[PDB]
Amino acid sequence: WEIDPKDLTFLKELGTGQFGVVKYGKWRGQYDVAIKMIKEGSMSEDEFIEEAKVMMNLSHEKLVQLYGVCTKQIFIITEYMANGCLLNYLREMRHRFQTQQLLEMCKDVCEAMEYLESKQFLHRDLAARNCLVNDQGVVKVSDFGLSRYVLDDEYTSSVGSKFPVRWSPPEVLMYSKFSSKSDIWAFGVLMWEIYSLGKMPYERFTNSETAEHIAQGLRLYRPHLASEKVYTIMYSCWHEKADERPTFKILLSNILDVMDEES
Numbered sequence: 001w002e003i004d005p006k007d008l009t010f011l012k013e014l015g016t017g018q019f020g021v022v023k024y025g026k027w028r029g030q031y032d033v034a035i036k037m038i039k040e041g042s043m044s045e046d047e048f049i050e051e052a053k054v055m056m057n058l059s060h061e062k063l064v065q066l067y068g069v070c071t072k073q074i075f076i077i078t079e080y081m082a083n084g085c086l087l088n089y090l091r092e093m094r095h096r097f098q099t100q101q102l103l104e105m106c107k108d109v110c111e112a113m114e115y116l117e118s119k120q121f122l123h124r125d126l127a128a129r130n131c132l133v134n135d136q137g138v139v140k141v142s143d144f145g146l147s148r149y150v151l152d153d154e155y156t157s158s159v160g161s162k163f164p165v166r167w168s169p170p171e172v173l174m175y176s177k178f179s180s181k182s183d184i185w186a187f188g189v190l191m192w193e194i195y196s197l198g199k200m201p202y203e204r205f206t207n208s209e210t211a212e213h214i215a216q217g218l219r220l221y222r223p224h225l226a227s228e229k230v231y232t233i234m235y236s237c238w239h240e241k242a243d244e245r246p247t248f249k250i251l252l253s254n255i256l257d258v259m260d261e262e263s
């Protein structure tokens with residue numbers, strides 16, 4: 001798990017956020033890595049460190065690979081994803097995506113989430129902004145579980161000003177009821193983000209208005225590029241009743257069937 005920071009060569013900035021700075025680098029002169037440099041005071045680092053052991057055993061081809069941690073200082077060393085943030089990827093209209101490509105990004109994500117669900121592991125913050133894209137156009141799930149160590153309460157509480165209201169089911173917004181089925185809800189919103197080419201969910205609403213809308217039964221409506229069958233899959237994620245929402249196993253079966261049918 002422990003990486004010697006001396007084996008790292010820093011090369012380029014990839015991205016900055018509230019919790020850290022990610023740089024493109026090499027490990028022992030040769031191997032491409034992303035180095036996540038945690039900002040001092042953003043993170044419950046000693047809690048994270050014990051968690052990093054269960055995370056070092058999470059391994060799936062659609063899950064951004066954790067390589068290790070540098071904890072004698074603090075850095076997280078992960079798989080480098082050359083096409084970067086999925087949300088930015090979706091907004092680049094130059095890709096001129098076929099709907100078959102969009103459905104494949106949904107499947108990549110669903111495969112990752114099916115694996116996490118198999119391990120009773122919650123993402124807790126599934127959204128396009130937390131997916132990455134590799135050099136072969138493969139989507140992988142990133143930053144799964146890490147919100148649990150974020151010290152800023154504007155990010156972590158449901159009433160917080162940086163909480164992911166637009167990816168949260170009513171039982172989360174009302175009661176803080178987090179479950180496999182809040183990830184299923186989030187996944188539905190993600191499929192919407194993909195098929196909308198990276199529009200903000202509830203584009204015309206505030207987070208306050210989104211929460212009021214969701215509570216009354218308002219839903220995201222069908223993106224132009226989504227077929228009726230694709231829309232049926234994303235909408236199935238948004239049942240008012242958590243126990244009426246599919247598993248990730250059932251969602252992956254649904255996506256595969258539409259891939260075969262071509263909806």
Ligand SMILES: O=C(Nc1cccc([C@@H]2CN(c3ncnc4[nH]ccc34)CCN2CCO)c1)Nc1c(F)cccc1N1CCCC1
Pocket residue numbers: 014015016017018019020021022034036038043064078079080081082084085125130132142143146147149150
């Ligand atoms: O701060 C992060 N991650 C982070 C920070 C900065 C940048 C990036 C990615 C980095 N980018 C990458 N480009 C290419 N290969 C890559 N591999 C890994 C990241 C990456 C290029 C795109 N960037 C997006 C910005 O444009 C991510 N995680 C995090 C944490 F350390 C501590 C606590 C919580 C969190 N989670 C909680 C929920 C969300 C964050």
